[PDB]
Amino acid sequence: ERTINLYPLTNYTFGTKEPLYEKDSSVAARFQRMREEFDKIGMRRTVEGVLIVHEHRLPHVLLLQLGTTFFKLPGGELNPGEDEVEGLKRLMTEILGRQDGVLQDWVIDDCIGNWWRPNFEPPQYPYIPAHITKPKEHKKLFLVQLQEKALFAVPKNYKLVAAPLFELYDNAPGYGPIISSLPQLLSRFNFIYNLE
């Protein structure tokens, strides 16, 4: 099996840093940027981190929230040739990393899933459909192990939230197909719920 340590939500200090805005202004624009980028460099490689905490013996995924309805995992695009893990570390540091100059290494060990984007369009799937040779994006999900205590500096345009599994489960409407199946993908691990 595989044993993962969880800690209470209140073990973590939420801070703020300066806002971090999406590279593109519109849905239409991001798919043309994807279209253009692919044709020079090929498949986009995205990595994302699943940070798990708990309250009351039940796991919570840390999500970033924009507005009312929009949710996303900390993560982002890999630069060409970049190692998967080394770049998720980078992306973690850039998103939630503290700025008071404390050391903060990210412990990223397990891959909890893969999602591919067949065309330049919203849909993604946990497999490469059989008519597709060159997916436009490959999204890889990693489990990030948290320290007993930590400070995340959350960019001011985002709001860091802990979603209990029951809120995510069978809730694609709320969270999309990737996040809503986090419960299922989390289920293989053996969680220890330390108390603080």
Binding site: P123, Y125, P129, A130, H131, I132
Partner: protein, 81 residues
């Protein structure tokens, strides 16, 4: 100049398509997007294939149904858009 190519197995790939089209003397394929179930990603067995020259359109209409892809004769239908 767009053409629709259907009667494809759900495992007929874009690479499968460009080969066939190529081994027919067409080398001006512009675009290939399949039609897919949104929920699934599974291909509905037909695709839109853009082609650069009127001549290349004629070659696909006359010749592509003659060659079998994965045991099936493609069906070609010119786009009237």
């Amino acid at each position: 100049i767009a053409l629709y190519i259907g009667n494809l197995t759900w495992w007929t790939t874009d690479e499968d398509l460009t080969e066939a089209v190529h081994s027919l003397g067409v080398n001006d394929i512009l675009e290939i997007k399949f039609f897919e179930n949104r929920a699934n990603g599974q291909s509905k067995g037909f695709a839109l294939v853009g082609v650069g020259s009127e001549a290349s359109s004629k070659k696909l209409m006359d010749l592509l149904p003659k060659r079998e892809l994965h045991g099936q004769n493609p069906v070609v239908t010119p786009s009237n858009k």
